[PDB]
C-alpha cells in the first residue's frame, strides 16, 4: 500500500500483455453486463473508456479496472476488498494476485454473490 | 458525512483537479498525455509513465486514488484544513499530486 511501479525481470512483452489483457477485460465487460440485467441493482452503469472499465453498484461502491502498462498488470479497486494487483501465470493460465493467490475471475465472483446475492460465472 | 455532502464536495474537488491538469498538459510537453473523466472516474495517462485513476467510494465516504508512483491512498475530508487527508501518512490530495507531477514532468503545478 506504498510501492507503485517496482521493477521485475520476468518482463512479458508488451505485445503479449495487451492481447490477454485486452480480452480478459473485454470477456468481463460482456458478462457483466448480463448480470445487470438478470439482476435489479439500483444505479447499475458497467462502462468502458480511455482503457479503465467502471462497474457502479449504485449504493452499494464502484469496481475500477486498468491495465498498467510498465508493470504488465491488471490493477483493480474493490469496494470490499480493495486494492491488488494481477499477473499472468503461464502454468495456471490465469491472472493471480500473489500477495494471496487469489484468481482474477474467482475473486469477482465470490464477491460479487455475497453483494448482489445472485451467482455468476466468469471462468 | 451525509452522502448529499459527500457527492458535493467530491465532485468540486475531481472537477477543479480536471481543469488544472488540462491546463498543465497544454504548458508542459509530455508524449502520450491524455486526460479525460467518464461515469464519476478521473483517469490521466502520462503515456509510457502509467495511469492515474480517481474515484469516489460512496459507501465510505473517501475519495480512492491510484497511482503509478505510489500506488493506492484513501482520502477522508478534514473539516479543520479543508483538504483531502489519507489518515495512515497525513498527506493532502492535492499537494501529493502536486509533488509526483513536478518529479515526473520537470514543471511545477498549483492544484490549491
Same mark, same amino acid.
Given at each position: 500500500?506504498?510501492?507503485?511501479?517496482?521493477?521485475?525481470?520476468?518482463?512479458?512483452?508488451?505485445?503479449?500483455?495487451?492481447?490477454?489483457?485486452?480480452?480478459?477485460?473485454?470477456?468481463?465487460?460482456?458478462?457483466?453486463? *448480463?448480470?445487470?440485467? %438478470?439482476?435489479? !441493482?439500483?444505479?447499475?452503469?458497467?462502462?468502458?473508456?480511455?482503457?479503465? #472499465?467502471?462497474?457502479? =453498484?449504485?449504493?452499494?461502491?464502484?469496481y475500477?479496472?486498468?491495465?498498467?502498462?510498465?508493470?504488465?498488470?491488471?490493477?483493480?479497486?474493490?469496494?470490499?476488498?480493495?486494492?491488488?494487483?494481477?499477473?499472468? *501465470?503461464?502454468?495456471? %493460465?490465469?491472472? !493471480?494476485?500473489?500477495?494471496?493467490?487469489?484468481?482474477?475471475?474467482?475473486? #469477482?465472483?465470490?464477491? =460479487?454473490?455475497?453483494?448482489?446475492?445472485?451467482?455468476?460465472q466468469?471462468?
Amino acid at each position: 500500500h506504498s510501492s507503485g511501479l517496482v521493477p521485475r525481470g520476468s518482463h512479458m512483452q508488451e505485445e503479449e500483455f495487451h492481447k490477454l489483457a485486452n480480452f480478459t477485460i473485454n470477456h468481463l465487460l460482456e458478462k457483466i453486463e *448480463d448480470y445487470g440485467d %438478470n439482476v435489479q !441493482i439500483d444505479g447499475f452503469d458497467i462502462d468502458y473508456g480511455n482503457e479503465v #472499465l467502471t462497474l457502479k =453498484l449504485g449504493s452499494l461502491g464502484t469496481y475500477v479496472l486498468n491495465k498498467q502498462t510498465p508493470n504488465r498488470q491488471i490493477w483493480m479497486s474493490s469496494p470490499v476488498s480493495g486494492p491488488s494487483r494481477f499477473d499472468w *501465470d503461464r502454468d495456471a %493460465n490465469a491472472w !493471480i494476485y500473489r500477495r494471496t493467490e487469489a484468481k482474477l475471475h474467482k475473486l #469477482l465472483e465470490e464477491e =460479487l454473490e455475497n453483494l448482489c446475492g445472485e451467482p455468476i460465472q466468469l471462468s
